Amino acid sequence: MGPGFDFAQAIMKKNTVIARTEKGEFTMLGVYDRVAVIPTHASVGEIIYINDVETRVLDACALRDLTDTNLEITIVKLDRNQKFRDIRHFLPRCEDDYNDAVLSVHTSKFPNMYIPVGQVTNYGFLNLGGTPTHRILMYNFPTRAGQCGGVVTTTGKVIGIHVGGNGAQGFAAMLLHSYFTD
Structure with missing residues (x-):
C-alpha cells in the first residue's frame, strides 16, 4: 500500500x-x-x-x-x-529501536501476509517460553501461531524474525550483519 x-x-x-x-x-x-x-x-x-x-x-x-x-x-x-540474492547489506550493524515496521509471513496457512506493526522497541531480555533470551525487539500487535519466522522490515532494513507473542505484544529476534560474515 x-x-x-x-x-x-x-x-x-x-x-x-x-x-x-x-x-x-x-x-x-x-x-x-x-x-x-x-x-x-x-x-x-x-x-x-x-x-x-x-x-x-x-x-x-x-x-x-x-x-x-x-x-x-x-x-x-x-x-x-x-x-x-545476497541481502546482507540490508542488515543493521547495531542493536536499535525502529519506527513503522512490517511483519511479513508466507506459509500454506498464511500466504502473502503483511502486518503494519508500528513502533519497534529494543526490549532486550525476554523469558521466551521459559528460556532467558536476549536481543528481543517488541511491537504492540496481537501476533498469533503461524507467524513465527516472519520477517520484520523497515524501509531499507531487514531487522529481525518473529519468535513469539503474549496475546497483546509480538517479539522478534534481532538480525545483525555480524551474524553472517564469511
Missing part, C-alpha cells in the same frame, strides 16, 4: 522459502548463498523440507550471545541447487 509494504514485498518475493520441520511450517529468510535463518524452536535436524522438497541440512547453529544466553536464531546452510 506504501513504501514500507514495497520493501517488505521485495524481500518476500526473492528471499523467503517455506520451511517444514517436525515442529511445523515456518517462514524462512534466505540471507546469502545457501544460508538462511529460522527460529531455534523449529528444532532443525539433518533433513528439512524447503517448498515441499526434501533437503539435506549441511550445517545448523543455534546462536547464543557471549553471556551464553539464547538468541533464538538458528543459521542453516541448505544443500540446495540455487543461491539466495
Whole structure:
C-alpha cells in the first residue's frame, strides 16, 4: 500500500522459502548463498523440507550471545541447487529501536501476509517460553501461531524474525550483519 509494504514485498518475493520441520511450517529468510535463518524452536535436524522438497541440512547453529544466553536464531546452510540474492547489506550493524515496521509471513496457512506493526522497541531480555533470551525487539500487535519466522522490515532494513507473542505484544529476534560474515 506504501513504501514500507514495497520493501517488505521485495524481500518476500526473492528471499523467503517455506520451511517444514517436525515442529511445523515456518517462514524462512534466505540471507546469502545457501544460508538462511529460522527460529531455534523449529528444532532443525539433518533433513528439512524447503517448498515441499526434501533437503539435506549441511550445517545448523543455534546462536547464543557471549553471556551464553539464547538468541533464538538458528543459521542453516541448505544443500540446495540455487543461491539466495545476497541481502546482507540490508542488515543493521547495531542493536536499535525502529519506527513503522512490517511483519511479513508466507506459509500454506498464511500466504502473502503483511502486518503494519508500528513502533519497534529494543526490549532486550525476554523469558521466551521459559528460556532467558536476549536481543528481543517488541511491537504492540496481537501476533498469533503461524507467524513465527516472519520477517520484520523497515524501509531499507531487514531487522529481525518473529519468535513469539503474549496475546497483546509480538517479539522478534534481532538480525545483525555480524551474524553472517564469511
